[PDB]
């Protein structure tokens, strides 16, 4: 067709589109926005990974209402009879059929675009009304169903294990604490809600580093909820250690936390494993030499193992996660840095010949990190909810009403009092726990 009444015709060129290198299906490196739509709706072939990647990452170079407009421009093919008959069986048909595949993928895996913009949804139902022709009058049956479904805001596969109880009796929420709940059931329950926190994170909340700017609270709410959860347990662990002023009760608390870690590492809950490692690394907890001096050497190895994960830019951690088999709760913080660095170390508009192209190679990399986050979000955990305990950990507010300085400072002053510097000698402190301090152990049945 004409190069003017249909803009998706301008021929390819080294100022319109660049492909990657290395074998028979092209991969886009950069491209103007028009070219990028054209390849998103190509007559010759469909590209599912392009479609997937594009709908995940376009909002940083083209606003969602622009996209809809392009997708319609792409659909209004004009007419130039024998080799114009091919111009219907081989061209307009595939294109138009590949616009509607976009619209279906769009309105079905990224519906948040239409939650946040009624007019965008309006135009789409308008546009899919204009769709006629019994070839697609069946794609439009599929998209409009999807639309309506989306407007309507346990089944364990195997048998869960039996729910371990230790001192605290079922139904007695008032006795629930670190040392009286069963260590196995603590790690189970934390891991349970920690996984559910992890699974809630939608890629709308990561792409664009949007959790690091003014509207993080509007846009990245379940990620923040997930980060704030693990911040609180780390602080709780710390408050439990240094607020146990007695040396013997403290070695009992540190011991019980390392044991939780143990079940954590058994469940492949790397988030909860790192909650504990961070606790043990804080400047209050790390300095208590007397308290670690009495840890069973088998336990010191268990913690040494976990801390070494973190060492060397998380090398051992990264290894282990790629080997273990789900269910699994990964540590989110690494994908956070990888997504920022990637978005900030690759240019937004690779320029060539004097015109800007949209760096889609940079977008593809961000999409890959997002994709990887999802592969760990699908397999759930074969463990039973103890709603009484879940409520206990849900409510942990170790910081009280204190700001973070006041509290961090307090936690350090407390470690200072209970194990003083070299000159002044170690005072002895009352017991506060009235129950016995022996670990029920970390084996079931």
């Amino acid at each position, epitope marked *: 067709p004409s190069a003017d009444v249909y803009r998706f015709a301008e021929p390819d060129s080294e100022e319109n589109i660049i492909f990657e290198e290395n074998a028979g299906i092209p991969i886009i490196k950069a491209g103007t926005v028009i070219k990028l739509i054209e390849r998103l709706t190509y007559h010759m072939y469909a590209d599912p990974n392009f479609v997937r990647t594009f709908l995940t990452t376009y909002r940083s170079f083209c606003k969602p209402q622009e996209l809809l407009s392009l997708i319609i421009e792409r659909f209004e093919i004009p007419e130039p009879s024998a080799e114009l008959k091919r111009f219907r069986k081989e061209y307009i048909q595939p294109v138009q059929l590949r616009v509607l595949n976009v619209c279906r993928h769009w309105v079905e895996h990224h519906f948040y675009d239409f939650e946040r913009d009624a007019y965008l949804l309006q135009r789409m139902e308008e546009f899919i009304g204009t769709v006629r022709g019994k070839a697609m009058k069946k794609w439009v049956e599929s998209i409009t169903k999807i639309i309506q479904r989306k407007k309507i805001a346990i089944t364990f596969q195997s048998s869960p294990p039996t729910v371990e109880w230790h001192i605290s009796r079922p139904g007695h929420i008032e006795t629930f604490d670190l040392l009286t709940l069963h260590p196995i059931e603590i790690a189970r329950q934390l891991t349970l809600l920690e996984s559910d926190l992890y699974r809630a994170v939608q890629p709308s909340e990561l792409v664009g580093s949007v959790w690091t700017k003014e509207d993080k609270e509007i846009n990245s709410p379940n990620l923040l909820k997930m980060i704030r959860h693990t911040t609180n347990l780390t602080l709780w662990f710390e408050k439990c250690i240094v607020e146990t002023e007695n040396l013997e009760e403290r070695v009992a608390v540190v011991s019980r936390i390392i044991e939780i870690l143990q079940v954590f590492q058994e469940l492949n809950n790397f988030n909860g494993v790192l909650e504990v490692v961070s606790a043990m690394n804080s400047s209050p907890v790390y300095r208590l030499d007397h308290t670690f001096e009495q840890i069973p050497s088998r336990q010191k190895k268990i913690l040494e193992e976990a801390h070494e994960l973190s060492e060397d830019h998380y090398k051992k951690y990264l290894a282990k996660l790629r080997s273990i088999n789900p269910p699994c709760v990964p540590f989110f913080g690494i994908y956070l840095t990888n997504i920022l660095k990637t978005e900030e170390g690759n240019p937004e508009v690779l320029k060539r010949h004097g015109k800007e192209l949209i760096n889609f190679s940079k977008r593809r990399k961000v999409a890959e990190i997002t994709g990887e986050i999802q592969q760990y979000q699908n397999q759930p955990y074969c463990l039973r909810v103890e709603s009484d305990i879940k409520r206990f950990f849900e409510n942990l507010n170790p910081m009280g009403n204190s700001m973070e300085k006041e509290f961090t400072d307090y936690l350090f002053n407390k470690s200072l*009092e209970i194990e003083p510097r070299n000159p002044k000698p170690l005072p002895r402190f009352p017991k506060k726990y009235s129950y016995p301090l022996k670990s029920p152990g970390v084996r079931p049945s």
Partner: nanobody
Amino acid sequence: QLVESGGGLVQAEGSLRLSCLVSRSNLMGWYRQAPGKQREFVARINPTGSANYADSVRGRFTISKDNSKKTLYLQMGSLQPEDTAVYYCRLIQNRDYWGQGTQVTVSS
């Protein structure tokens, strides 16, 4: 900055009062060292809430601070022989500022 003390010697069932001159998010207390025995915590005020006492001394001792006058007191009442110890003043702000510790020996 320094920490000070004021007390002395007195007989059983007495009412000895102790002082400290400190010369914000902090915590301060008292410790005593009975001779031949390990240093012992007696009491503290985390300004956050209230004060805690050692088990030995539950209802006989009481802590306080006149923020107006940079001072900290341990009130010792219903004294006994067993509390014969040097009694240290101690304020943890970002450093452990301790005190030399006046002597307190009680006879019957």
